[PDB]
Amino acid sequence: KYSTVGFNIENSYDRLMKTIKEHKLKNYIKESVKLFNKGLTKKDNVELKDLANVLSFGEAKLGDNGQKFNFLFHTASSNVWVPSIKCTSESCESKNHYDSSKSKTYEKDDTPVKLTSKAGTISGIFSKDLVTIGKLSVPYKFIEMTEIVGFEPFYSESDVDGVFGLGWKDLSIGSIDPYIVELKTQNKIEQAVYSIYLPPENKNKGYLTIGGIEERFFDGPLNYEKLNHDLMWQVDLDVHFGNVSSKKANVILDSATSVITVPTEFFNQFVESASVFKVPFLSLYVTTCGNTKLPTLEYRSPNKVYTLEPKQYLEPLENIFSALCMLNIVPIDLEKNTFVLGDPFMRKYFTVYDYDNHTVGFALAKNL
């Protein structure tokens, strides 16, 4: 009904399987687990980086000759970003390039932009052209990147060329609205809204629907929560995991994060006497799939609580050990009292991101 596009996901389960194969870790995990079960055991650090799922799609096009690109979706950035044919860096060499001279619809803007991050540095310029996905279209100001430094095992090894922002945060000062806001402005869609539908039975797929609430994706009502930040898909919620709880937490919806995160303190209380096993030397917390002590996780707002049963926050690891599962929950300290809801939450809740109203909505996904 509304324009929907599918995107691929490389998730942390996949990357963990790759590590396991790379380093021949299966039997090690299996024997450590067997040790825990006997139970002959007990007797630090992961990176927000490592928790990133890659959400990518290849059908967005720039300019009227439809220059093809592979984009990953970024839920915090408001900009779209693409390697310039002028790009200086060796990173750019294997990538698809935007060549403004080849489009009749390009309009020069040339305002320079610069991103400086821990992970790396991006320099470029604003350029204006048609940006299409693929039902939808709008002349749009995006960053043409002229230099890319860092980001640098991922970028080269990825087939990703650029970033397509589904967030709020614009690097310009030119008040370039998000691509989805721009769509609504030029009347390509009725509302500056999109939704994420992550099908529960295909962890390598998600769907983005733009400009409308597609009823086929969900059962029951949609509950909306007000953003608690001008520029973040982030909401106030009391979080309860068993008897471990934190009031007025900050909870970011980020379907590009591969897991549920919790502060490290909070997690330690959670996992104590939950009979969950931390495999030595690996960032891998493991438990039996039927673990009868694992609680329903609760995210409570004044008028709705969002929950996740063990079934939705564990990942079977049966290709390692029968009835083994891993915890899809990672202890990580961001700002005080900040939690993120990533892929596992969104496998249960169809989610709606409403730029016009500064709301996020949730409904019980269908199994499609």
Q: What distance in Å separates the CA atoms of residue 202 and residue 288, rounded to the nearest whole number?
A: 22
201, 214 in Cβ contact below 8 A? no
The one-letter amino acid at 231 = L
Q: What distance in Å separates the CA atoms of residue 157 and residue 174, rounded to the nearest whole number?
A: 33
- Residue 348, preceding bond cis, omega within 30 degrees? no
| Structure tokens that stand for 272 in this block | 């104590």
Q: What distance in Å separates the CA atoms of residue 116 and residue 49, rounded to the nearest whole number?
A: 16
Q: What distance in Å separates the CA atoms of residue 337 and residue 262, rounded to the nearest whole number?
A: 8
Q: The tokens 């002590």 sit on which residue?
A: 293
CB atoms within 10 A of CB 232: 17
Counting Cα atoms < 13 Å in the Cβ hemisphere of 320 gives 27
The one-letter amino acid at 352 = V
> Which residues are CB-contacts of 335 (< 8 A; sequence separation ≥ 6)?
250
| Structure tokens that stand for 223 in this block | 């509950």
SS3 string of 138-197? EEEEEEEEEEEEECCCHHHHCCCCEEEECCCECCCCCCCCCHHHHHHHCCCCCCCEEEEE
- CA dihedral for 163, 168, 174, 177, sign (positive or negative): positive
The domain segmentation of the chain, as residue ranges, is 1-54+216-368, 55-215
Counting Cα atoms < 13 Å in the Cβ hemisphere of 136 gives 27
> Which residues are CB-contacts of 365 (< 8 A; sequence separation ≥ 6)?
197, 198, 199, 200, 217, 218, 346, 347, 348, 349, 350
117, 182 in Cβ contact below 8 A? no
Q: What distance in Å separates the CA atoms of residue 258 and residue 328, rounded to the nearest whole number?
A: 8
Question: In whole angstroms, how far apart are CA 311 and each of 65, 173, 200, 283, 328?
Answer: 47, 45, 11, 20, 10
The resolution in angstroms reads 2.1
Q: Which of 339, 365, 353, 146 minimizes the C-alpha distance to 249?
A: 339
112, 119 in Cβ contact below 8 A? no
Is 129 a known active-site residue? Answer: no
Query: 55-215 adopts what CATH topology?
Result: Cathepsin D, subunit A; domain 1 (2.40.70)
| Structure tokens that stand for 259 in this block | 């897991």
| Structure tokens that stand for 80 in this block | 């779209």
Strand-pair category, 324-327 with 285-288:
antiparallel
Q: What distance in Å separates the CA atoms of residue 145 and residue 71, rounded to the nearest whole number?
A: 14
294, 362 in Cβ contact below 8 A? no
Give the chain's length: 368
Q: What distance in Å separates the CA atoms of residue 111 and residue 172, rounded to the nearest whole number?
A: 9
Strand-pair category, 359-365 with 244-253:
unpaired
Q: The tokens 């996740």 sit on which residue?
A: 308
Spot the catalytic one: 129, 254, 343, 354: 254
Architecture per CATH, domain 1-54+216-368, reads as Beta Barrel (2.40)
Region class of 318: left (phi > 0), else alpha (psi between -120 and 50), else beta? alpha
DSSP category for residue 84: B
CB atoms within 10 A of CB 187: 8
| Structure tokens that stand for 162 in this block | 């650029």
